[PDB]
Symmetry: D3
Subunit: 94 residues, 6 copies
């Protein structure tokens, strides 16, 4: 279950691209992916998610914040009732 | 205000944090970003932003950026304290 | 009264883009603009200009030097008799 | 292991060096790149690499990269000592 | 020579300055840029530049660049002192 | 006798471009070139070469390592019997 998303970015006006990632609350809707040539910071605005990066699972809850380095495969699963929402910022590496 | 910045530079690319504005009026911040680009995301509250010429209200779940070498102000314009998550890069 | 200008840049030979900005001496010929995704340094080689950046006016004369950060609206007015000339260097931000 | 890094920052863009693994098993290295991108080129030996999930054998005259903020391991899996030339950039 | 570099790093992206060559022959400079890219603009005088292999005369209102990790020389080849405005970035 | 070469680079997977430069053992096969907007590091895996950069000749043998800064003309001559092989890494400047 792959995904890009869902970017707000006016490269002439502002430095960072950013947006919101939404995960429907079915453990059907866990999301495998890859950062490619960009660094991402996520911030959990709603939900409980389980993150998998390199060789690590961790649980992230509302208010907690995680980062994906460039060229990394990573996954995110929803672990709660509500849909999960993450604000993110990203930069393509230089 | 209350700023706290998290940055373990040997593990992460970005620095991030929470800016809390215990809010009335009060409750408020003046600044200058320096060699720093910042993105703020509003997680609770309604806030008023001044960068450069501009002034806008910015509301829960919205987002704004401050470019390097700009002076900016953030003022709480609501009854509950305002909280923002922010990400930053100190440029070069 | 908007303007780009007027760039010398062989991206395979050299690091910086650069050039010369010329303002005709009519206060008709003041010039609103925006740096977008680039940093500019100006150097007044002839004239007296008034610069407006972010929220600041300043006067610049022959020999004086100013900078525009990226993503900034800025304006330049000629305030003297002669046409005004500025050498500049610029870099698009990373 | 034996690492030696050459970097005269005022003359060169990159840092480089030789990583020697006096090899049996032994003979081996655990790590984390940090704010550093690394490329390794195998000049003598056969080595086993672990970055992230992956594990591969990497043989004389082959080449592999480690991205910043990844933990990696290199183990000698051959009878002669292994030597790698590497180039790195400490990012920003 | 007389160099003076202006750089308030918390307010500006670039460093800049004036290089004065009180000129006869004299009057002259040898160097190496290091981790620095430089642009020079000639505001008064005629000067002779050596970067790498090259040698050229460079005249009032003209412009030349020096790449990082190159040795360069600037010599005054005129009767009045030479002055250059320059901009630089110390790379990474 | 000009040359590019011969690059392995999946820009979405990895940070550096890299490869191997091979010089046939005829002093016919010396190779003038230019780094343009990139920094290169070379590593002599086989041979004896003579490098010319900016204003410098130097001899490089097996195991020795040299660098070309961006925007530089440079040449490489084979000085030995065998064909000469150099591993290299490169980055286009920012």
């Amino acid at each position: 279950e792959n995904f890009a998303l869902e970017i707000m970015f006016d490269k002439h006006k502002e430095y960072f691209a950013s947006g919101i990632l939404k995960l429907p609350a079915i453990s059907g809707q866990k999301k495998l992916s890859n950062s490619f040539r960009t660094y991402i910071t996520f911030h959990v605005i709603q939900g409980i998610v389980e993150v998998t990066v390199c060789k690590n699972k961790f649980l992230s809850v509302k208010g907690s914040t995680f980062q994906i380095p460039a060229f990394n495969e990573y996954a995110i699963a929803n672990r709660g009732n509500d849909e999960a929402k993450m604000f993110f910022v990203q930069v393509t590496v230089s």
